């Protein structure tokens, strides 16, 4: 029975793999693309040929969409799994790490690095990078729908992608690295990026239309030795993109005033920790300075990726930043990978140069592992923590929303909280109490003047023992 399995079953199951995991979902996605392109074409035909003479899903815009603004203890939030429409669920031997979720005007993005076996030392199997459409299923509930899916030819050399929607296309910027993760092997990183355009409405024979992976022959760095994009989503300002990033500054060039290190209320902290925790290790050659990547499309055929650094007010180490256009003005999440374990997100006062009015929050923090746990403000040398973003869902009352891991050190219990800057209003426990989790990416939008939110929560499944990104469409309720 070696011959039957080797010939009549083996290659046929390989063909069914290739078909029903590559070419059937790509054709259903391209089918939905033709649905939407057709509907846009006939609506343009009606707006031309019926405009007589005489002889959906969109992001948070400035409409007063009323939500619950009063603190309750009742379970008023109802989380909904919508992860089933994606290639989230692999087999039991693959761990799904390094995710992305990036929504703007209804057209998302989604990437993940599928590994083999363990989540850390596994071999990178593939890297889906795929844009799509945020929809509504038959119950007034959003759900994702991938139209265009691309994979790079060398999955070991694509790190830290950032993904911004731009005018019915989708521009995803990553980091080419043959020497490992450029945060880690930073002195030997080649200093090279690559941008891959995708189309959120692909076509039948759109070869150079769908995936035209651009070159980047000019990066405006400045003082910084290397620049890498770092964080899930960004904004567009017309033709100008803003990928979240980090800039590898040589430590001997980094100039910092140690009197600014807030050792006032804390006694176990020198004023020499705030400089040394700017790198991942206090004798590292480079220093992570988060920021943005101004990518204006109006520069011609070969544009320039310009690194904008961040303002030094409430400055810590380079985190996955996430600038997002919410209610008109960009809001800048920037995670807590350092001593400042409170949430560090705020409205953007000006984009170039990047000066972020950081919200003075004291109820939302992230679980750090060893030295810098949840609710630590003492300046200590650590590069610890996880990514737990927050989307601004109300600016009039300064309410935001995201999934946060309610435990001090063990990164567990992901809780969808909706919080003011000094009090958590209400919250939803997405899973069990000891459900170990990681990076959560929350994006919100309007489905028929209702604020829904998609929180990609990497939940460790206790059943088959690997990490899967589970989405959670959670409606922000109006009645309390």
């Amino acid at each position, epitope marked *: 029975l070696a011959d039957k399995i080797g010939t009549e079953i083996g290659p046929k199951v390989s063909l069914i793999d290739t078909s029903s995991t590559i070419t059937i979902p790509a054709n259903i996605g391209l089918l939905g693309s033709k649905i939407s392109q057709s509907t846009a074409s006939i609506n343009e035909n009606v707006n031309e040929k019926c405009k007589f003479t005489l002889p959906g899903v969109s992001n948070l815009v400035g409409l007063p969409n009323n939500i619950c603004l009063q603190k309750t203890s009742n379970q008023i939030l109802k989380p909904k799994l919508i992860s089933y429409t994606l290639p989230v669920v692999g087999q039991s031997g693959t761990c799904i790490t390094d995710p992305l979720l990036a929504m703007d005007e209804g057209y998302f993005a989604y990437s993940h690095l599928e590994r083999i076996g363990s989540c850390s030392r596994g071999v990178s199997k593939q890297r889906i990078i795929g844009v799509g459409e945020v929809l509504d299923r038959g119950d007034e509930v959003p759900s994702l729908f991938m139209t265009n899916v691309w994979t790079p030819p060398n999955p070991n050399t694509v790190y830290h992608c950032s993904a911004v929607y731009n005018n019915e296309f989708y521009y995803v910027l990553c980091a080419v690295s043959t020497v490992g993760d450029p945060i880690l092997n930073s002195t030997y990183w080649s200093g090279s990026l690559m941008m891959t355009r995708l189309a959120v409405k692909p076509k039948s024979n759109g070869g150079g239309y769908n995936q035209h992976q651009l070159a980047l022959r000019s990066i405006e760095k400045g003082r910084y030795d290397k620049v890498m994009p770092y964080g899930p989503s960004g904004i567009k300002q017309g033709d100008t993109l803003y990928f979240p990033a980090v800039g590898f500054l040589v430590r001997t060039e980094f100039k910092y005033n140690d009197s600014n290190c807030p050792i006032t209320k804390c006694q176990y902290s020198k004023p020499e920790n705030c400089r040394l925790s700017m790198g991942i290790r206090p004798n590292s050659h480079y220093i992570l300075r988060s920021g943005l990547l101004k990518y204006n499309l109006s520069d011609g055929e070969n544009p320039k990726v310009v690194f904008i650094e961040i303002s030094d007010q409430r400055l810590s180490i380079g985190s996955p930043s996430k600038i997002y256009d919410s209610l008109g003005q960009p809001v800048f999440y920037q995670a807590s990978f350092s001593w400042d374990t409170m949430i560090k997100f705020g409205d953007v006062l000006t984009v170039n140069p990047l000066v972020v009015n950081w919200r003075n929050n004291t109820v939302i923090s992230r679980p750090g*592992q060893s*030295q810098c746990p949840r609710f630590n403000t003492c300046p200590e040398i650590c590069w*610890e923590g996880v990514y737990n973003d927050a989307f601004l869902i109300d600016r009039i009352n300064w309410i935001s929303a995201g999934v946060f891991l309610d435990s001090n050190q063990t990164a567990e219990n992901p809780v969808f909280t909706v919080f003011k800057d000094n009090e958590i209003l209400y919250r939803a426990q997405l899973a069990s109490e000891d459900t170990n989790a990681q990076k959560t990416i929350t994006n919100c939008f309007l489905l028929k003047n209702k604020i829904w939110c998609i929180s990609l929560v990497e939940i460790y499944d206790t059943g088959d023992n690997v990490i899967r990104p589970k989405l959670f469409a959670v409606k922000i309720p109006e009645q309390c």
Partner: antibody
Amino acid sequence: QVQLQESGPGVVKPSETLSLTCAVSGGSISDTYRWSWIRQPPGKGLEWIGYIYGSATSTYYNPSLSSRVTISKDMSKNQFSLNLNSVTAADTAVYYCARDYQYYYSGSYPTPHNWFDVWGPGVLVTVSS
Amino acid sequence: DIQMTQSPSSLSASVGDRVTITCRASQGIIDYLSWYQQKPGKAPKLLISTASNLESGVPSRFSGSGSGTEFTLTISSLQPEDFATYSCLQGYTTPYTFGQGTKVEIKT
């Protein structure tokens, strides 16, 4: 290769200050993000005490030994100490010094895998009057 | 804290046996685990890090698998240079807690 070596009294009377020293040969403590201490009670299992950064002076300590353990430093003589205060007979153990190691996978995930690679040869310290 | 309970506390097997040593945790660590072979009168030695990696210098008869709350330290072909104390270590959070240890003896 970095080679550790403990040193200190095996004779410490109870309710006193243990004064150990793990001087480091083959490497500087200006390297090596963390340096730890581990004791092992004979007849019982290993249990970890607390680390020191080498380049910094920030510590962590085991909360079962939080109010007692002091880990001091000496950058010049390449040594780092241990000060267990108010010693009891149940603190009879083998106090290993250990070079700490971190495995960062995917540096948008700063939770490393932690283990100890280079251990000292150990020293038997019995609290006895 | 995280308690690391091993089973059994002292296992006995002849040369060439398949030895499976466990280390069950109280809170679920993801795979942040290391295995230590402490020879008598010697320092401990790292065997299997991240619960699935064979370290450089540890022979192929040592293998490890398992994640979450149940862990397996598998010794395929047991050898006379392997009868020592085996300990687990969790690295998921701090204080780093070792197991109580596993004593391995020769069944003769």
